[PDB]
Design a protein around this motif. Structure first.
Motif, mmCIF file in Angstrom:
data_model
loop_
_atom_site.group_PDB
_atom_site.id
_atom_site.type_symbol
_atom_site.label_atom_id
_atom_site.label_comp_id
_atom_site.label_asym_id
_atom_site.label_seq_id
_atom_site.Cartn_x
_atom_site.Cartn_y
_atom_site.Cartn_z
ATOM 1 N N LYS A 1 0.812 -1.093 -0.028
ATOM 2 C CA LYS A 1 -0.038 -0.025 0.034
ATOM 3 C C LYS A 1 0.716 1.314 -0.072
ATOM 4 O O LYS A 1 0.772 2.137 -0.917
ATOM 5 C CB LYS A 1 -0.975 0.005 1.265
ATOM 6 N N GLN A 2 1.845 1.154 0.800
ATOM 7 C CA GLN A 2 2.737 2.547 0.927
ATOM 8 C C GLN A 2 3.569 2.580 -0.391
ATOM 9 O O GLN A 2 3.604 3.654 -0.822
ATOM 10 C CB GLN A 2 3.940 1.773 1.812
ATOM 11 N N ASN B 1 1.279 4.671 -2.368
ATOM 12 C CA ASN B 1 1.377 5.959 -1.951
ATOM 13 C C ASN B 1 2.441 6.656 -2.444
ATOM 14 O O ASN B 1 2.373 7.862 -2.818
ATOM 15 C CB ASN B 1 1.141 5.864 -0.488
ATOM 16 N N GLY C 1 2.001 7.949 -5.558
ATOM 17 C CA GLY C 1 0.820 8.643 -5.851
ATOM 18 C C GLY C 1 -0.568 7.978 -6.109
ATOM 19 O O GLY C 1 -1.244 8.470 -6.932
ATOM 20 N N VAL C 2 -0.537 6.729 -5.529
ATOM 21 C CA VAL C 2 -1.725 6.214 -5.977
ATOM 22 C C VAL C 2 -2.321 5.557 -4.534
ATOM 23 O O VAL C 2 -1.769 4.940 -3.503
ATOM 24 C CB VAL C 2 -1.410 4.424 -6.570
ATOM 25 N N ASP C 3 -3.790 5.649 -4.662
ATOM 26 C CA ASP C 3 -4.384 5.397 -3.433
ATOM 27 C C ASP C 3 -5.338 4.194 -3.466
ATOM 28 O O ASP C 3 -5.938 3.925 -4.555
ATOM 29 C CB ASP C 3 -5.431 6.449 -2.719
ATOM 30 N N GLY C 4 -5.527 3.438 -2.480
ATOM 31 C CA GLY C 4 -5.977 2.108 -2.645
ATOM 32 C C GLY C 4 -6.069 1.378 -1.748
ATOM 33 O O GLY C 4 -5.387 1.560 -0.541
ATOM 34 N N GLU C 5 -7.000 0.178 -1.344
ATOM 35 C CA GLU C 5 -7.235 -0.550 -0.497
ATOM 36 C C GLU C 5 -7.143 -1.976 -0.808
ATOM 37 O O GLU C 5 -7.274 -2.346 -1.939
ATOM 38 C CB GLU C 5 -8.234 -0.169 0.403
ATOM 39 N N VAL D 1 -7.681 0.037 -6.557
ATOM 40 C CA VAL D 1 -7.133 1.483 -6.923
ATOM 41 C C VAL D 1 -8.172 2.200 -6.750
ATOM 42 O O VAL D 1 -9.515 1.684 -6.843
ATOM 43 C CB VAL D 1 -6.793 1.600 -8.594
ATOM 44 N N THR D 2 -8.187 3.421 -6.064
ATOM 45 C CA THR D 2 -9.250 4.370 -5.965
ATOM 46 C C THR D 2 -9.644 5.241 -6.868
ATOM 47 O O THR D 2 -10.564 5.515 -7.391
ATOM 48 C CB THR D 2 -9.338 5.000 -4.543
ATOM 49 N N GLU D 3 -8.345 5.716 -7.598
ATOM 50 C CA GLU D 3 -8.179 6.607 -8.471
ATOM 51 C C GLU D 3 -6.726 6.767 -9.022
ATOM 52 O O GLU D 3 -5.697 6.670 -8.201
ATOM 53 C CB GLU D 3 -8.727 8.061 -8.258
#
Lengths: 46, 46, 45, 46
Positions: free
Chosen positions: B21-22, B25, B28-32, C43-45
């Motif tokens: 996940k890090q 980040n 520059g990418v957000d996600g779960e 991915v969210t975006e």
């Protein structure tokens, strides 16, 4: 729900594809066997 | 392109999830981590 | 070779039976077992 | 437990592979990224 079968002589592959396609046809559903995009897995050396 | 990693040589899963996940980040990418619908595989009895 | 079938109209229980049946007919016995869980980095975006 | 990650944005695939491999090496386990055997999905036509 996802289902997976792995073939290898034992059982013929084309026959299997037939059977499954037939199953869907018998249930009023049309479809074909599509090749999936390649994918990679991290394999431990031991 | 799809990538798959398999855990269980015991390694902490939460740490792995975090590290990846890090990594996103940092790029520059957000996600779960979301769960996938179960998969059953036809297992030959041997 | 690896084959994949996604369900979910069409009864899942019968599909399993038909397939297991198909294999028993070709001499190979087996059972449907769950694979260990899978998580996808969404991915969210 | 299995983990899946799909790519192709700024995140380069080569670095992701390396980061993951690095993660394992850092945990004392060596391994490499290999391509999976081909997979076919029965695709419904609707």
């Amino acid at each position: 729900m996802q289902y997976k079968v792995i073939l290898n002589e034992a059982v013929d592959a084309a026959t299997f594809e037939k059977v499954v396609k037939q199953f869907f046809n018998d249930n009023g559903v049309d479809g074909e066997w599509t090749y999936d995009d390649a994918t990679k897995t991290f394999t431990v050396t031991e």
